[PDB]
Amino acid sequence: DSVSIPPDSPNYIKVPEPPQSSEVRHPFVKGHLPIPRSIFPKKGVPEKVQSGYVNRIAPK
Amino acid sequence: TIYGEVTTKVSGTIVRLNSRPPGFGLRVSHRIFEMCRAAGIRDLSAKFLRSRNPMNTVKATYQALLSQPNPEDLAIGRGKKLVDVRKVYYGGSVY
Amino acid sequence: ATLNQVMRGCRKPQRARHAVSPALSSIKSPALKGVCVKVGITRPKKPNSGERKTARVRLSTGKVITAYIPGEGHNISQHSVVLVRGGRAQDCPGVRYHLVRGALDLAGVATRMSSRSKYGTKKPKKAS
Amino acid sequence: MKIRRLFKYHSLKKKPIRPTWNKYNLYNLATAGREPRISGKTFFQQKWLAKSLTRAYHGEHIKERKWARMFSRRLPAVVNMDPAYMAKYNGSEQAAGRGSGLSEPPAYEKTADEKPAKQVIANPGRKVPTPYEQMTFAPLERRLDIAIFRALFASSARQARQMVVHGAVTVNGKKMKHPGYLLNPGDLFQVDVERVLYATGAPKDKKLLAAAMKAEDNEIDPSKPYMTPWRPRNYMSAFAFIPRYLEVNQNICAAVYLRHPVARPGESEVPSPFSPTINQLAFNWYLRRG
Amino acid sequence: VQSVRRQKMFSWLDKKGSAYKEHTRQGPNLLGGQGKDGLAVPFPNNPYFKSQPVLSEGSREIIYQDVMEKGLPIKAVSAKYNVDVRRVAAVIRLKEIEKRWIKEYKPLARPYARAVMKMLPQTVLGGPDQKPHESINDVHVHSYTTQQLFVPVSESREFTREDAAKAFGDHILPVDKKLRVPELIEFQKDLLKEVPLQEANRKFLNATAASEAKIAEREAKRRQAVEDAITRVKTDRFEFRFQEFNAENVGHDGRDRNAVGWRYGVPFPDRKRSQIKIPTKVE
Amino acid sequence: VLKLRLARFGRTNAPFYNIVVAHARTARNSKPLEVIGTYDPVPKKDTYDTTGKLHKDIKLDVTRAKYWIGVGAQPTDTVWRLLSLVGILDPKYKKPQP
RNA sequence: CAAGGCAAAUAGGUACAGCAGUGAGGAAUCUUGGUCAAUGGGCCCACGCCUGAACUGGUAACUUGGAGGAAUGAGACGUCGAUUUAUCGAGUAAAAUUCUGUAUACAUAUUGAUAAUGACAAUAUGUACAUUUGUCUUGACUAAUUACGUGCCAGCAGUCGCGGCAAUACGUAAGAGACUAGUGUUAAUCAUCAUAAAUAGGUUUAAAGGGUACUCAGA
RNA sequence: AUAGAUGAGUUUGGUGAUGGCUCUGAUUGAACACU
Ligand SMILES: [K+]
Ligand SMILES: [K+]
Ligand SMILES: [K+]
Ligand SMILES: [K+]
Ligand SMILES: [Mg+2]
Ligand SMILES: [Mg+2]
Ligand SMILES: [Mg+2]
Ligand SMILES: [Mg+2]
Ligand SMILES: [Mg+2]
Ligand SMILES: [Mg+2]
Ligand SMILES: [Mg+2]
Ligand SMILES: [Mg+2]
Ligand SMILES: [Mg+2]
Ligand SMILES: [Mg+2]
Ligand SMILES: [Mg+2]
Ligand SMILES: [Mg+2]
């Protein structure tokens, strides 16, 4: 925050709304994104997160 | 609005009236809009199921408004309160 | 029907209804070009009476149909290229099409003032 | 290009109520019929009559297709909760009897007894209807050009639309040139002071000014578009009102869009010159546009 | 010659419509006249729309001093003058803009202000407490709370607002928690316990003053996390802002509303009706 | 060959990019393995800042990008310049001082 | 490798379902542009080269979004059409007056891009400009009227219908009701249609109970 | 996602049913006519 919030911005005074006071219906977004692959197994601690793993598979 | 749902049959003309929340409006056909707008109803949903005979649609609709489930009688019959949830929530009847 | 009868395929598509203009509905086309094989007159059925100006057109698809000529007076004749659209003459049997007035050879009603877009009539431009 | 729909904008024969401060409009509003004739009309003839009357005022400058989808079946409302009631009662008494509370004797017995029964416990201000039907055209109250006209910064909804299109309005300190911008709760729109004084000021008359050449307070300045000293437009008081979803500040010609218009029990916040009977038919028309 | 319809107009416009040509009184002068509740009706055919009063110029200043000089919490100034917190926050923003103009020597529209304020009804916050400006306890009618439910329960159950909230839904709250100044309930409960008014007011200020501390603390930590995620690299021309995010939060099927990136497998909606192509948020 | 590159999206005269992990020999805008972030080339300006300074908004999952650079991903020249500013790689080009 | 088409004959190429473009077919769908500046890709130690991928200019109301002007306007004691020739309308409409400077034009700056490279354009600011109406309907469904002409003729028609000499339904005139840079029509799809009913139908007399019930599979 | 469920014309001397047809709503990578 380099420039102070002027009195024109709606964020000049923060007055949070009470819960369940709005029912805005967001529109369904079309399209999808590629699901990033998993790098570790879902059970157990893999050898990839050990102490000397990088120094073993990428020596100097 | 009316109490709950009602379905009346008059000689192959079935009418189904449903109670709707406030602000729903009279989303009903033309002849039911007149009867509701005259009796003081403002939120209702109707549906003809079998026949749309002009005469029997008015007789079945009028008979349905006179055969609504009375919560005061349903409670004494079963021996249990039928609490008006919307009345307890706002502390009184919000017309 | 029972759940077993439905599982075996009792529900089938309802029998198709014939279209008003089959030559156009069959191929999803809004209009078709054709040559006039004959230009004559058709007689309405029982209730109505008069002479309906019709034309036997050979569509570009090969079908020969009978089209109604809307308006008062026409310009087409034998061996005349005209555009055909849907819609039928209700009192004429077999006349299941109309001819477009602003078509290739068929001209629009010249002395037309109301509903000119229906008869392919340019504006008189008398004001300009 | 003047379209055919704007020819008789203030017809004294048709008497359409328009969103402006014109003197011909004031006469049509004052002499409007107490109730349109819907005695023997069919359901369609009633919905079309109500749609024509209301659309002559609400969103007059918006196409029928754009408003057909801008129309929303969601009529917001609020209820007033008295802290004094919620602090003394937990709502159980409202479920006494058989679920709907105790029964009170009929009206033809109360007055018969000289002693009036004790006041029934309930939240104050209940059993009063809410005018939901009057909120049919609430979505229009969110457009920027309309909010400017409701803040009394313009003499008409069309004049306010020109202030926006001509870069004279500033929302949240940023220039806004889209009259269709839908204000959000908390937005602060500001109009140029010069355009407000001309829009709401009196016309610049040369004949009267010609006599005032030489013959807190203000002075004369013929180098301005409005007549000096600035005085309010004629008949402006008949249209002077600010709804409660706006917080206007005339010193700087700025206003804040506090919230969206809502319906309260016994009150509506949508300025509409038509009765619930007409707003109920207009609402029923736009359910299926037929 | 003028048509008879114009002749009737100017006749009415000079005899009965002359009272509106110029505003000489102090207050609203509308066609509908004073209503049954003391408020002016602008349109006679719509009795429900009324000309609600406005905060007078003096009242706006009083609100500015209590929130800026005296440092009282907004919830306290709201409950004190019966002004909604959303309006109190607006009166301050608008007043701050005046101080800018007065400081920058900009001329205020004083002629327009005075002439218009006379046309509108006004409330004077201070000595004369005639009526509250507005209801500060209006709760929003939630869709779930609008349904007609008649729940069967035992003949002698104590069905409270907590039980009613659950009858509408599992996630619904009672109106006791949907207030903008919920401290008023705890304040009213003190009076029931025969607590002196002077002490009840003390607990109310400390309650509101303490609630705003948490709100101001949440916002501070929030904005901090928004900055800790941004890496600002200054180049010779611009300042590159690298915002960090978790690229794995795309949902179980890749269709997540809050996912970051131009989604694949979707054409342009630029040919669809009711397509919004103007800014929807001027932040 | 895995590459950290940009997928040009947006409209005419309104460029918008996706930072993606895709095989080199594939279509530019084909569905990649992952979307690491976005990149907007047109510099923006703070709303209430009258100083005239501009900036560029770039969303990047640095943790996910470091893993791919570690296993042998080859970022393009544009993505290389971005990754060098955040402080992951060394610049490939520099302004000659002489 | 074979075959037919085009080219080729002592040859052995070609197939535009790569971009632009032509002919044909069709109711019907566009430029034989610029640049590798941006993004991507091939080759290269490097520099660099190539890219009808791509980015950009062009054509079409095909669609969507936006603009396409606001305020004042009372006796020009003028005009026009009906008609209870003095009533009802055109009509605040016009003229005129006071303002704005929207699309757009021009100019400056910034930006798309940086190690360097800008084909083309966006955004911002300043100055300047007030520019079209079109189309359908008008018996009922379905919002909206008369007069004349025509006389089961000419024609209208989505459904029911209209027209046979005093037609609100045809044609013309005026008015009125609507949408509007679009408006109608044709074609198609969903919904209407519990009108193939899983959710959720029905079969005495209206479409629909098998001539019969012992029985394998199946429920 | 808790507001979302609607009809109209037309068979009969007449009435109530059965059952199609058409209109009312939304739309198109549309075409045509008048613009
Ligand atoms: K039926
Ligand atoms: K080609
Ligand atoms: K390149
Ligand atoms: K009939
Ligand atoms: Mg027939
Ligand atoms: Mg006409
Ligand atoms: Mg080929
Ligand atoms: Mg051809
Ligand atoms: Mg490259
Ligand atoms: Mg190299
Ligand atoms: Mg401009
Ligand atoms: Mg290069
Ligand atoms: Mg009618
Ligand atoms: Mg016609
Ligand atoms: Mg006619
Ligand atoms: Mg358009």
Ligand SMILES: [Mg+2]
């Ligand atoms: Mg049998």
Ligand SMILES: [Mg+2]
């Ligand atoms: Mg047999």
Ligand SMILES: [Mg+2]
């Ligand atoms: Mg048999």
Ligand SMILES: [Mg+2]
């Ligand atoms: Mg019989």
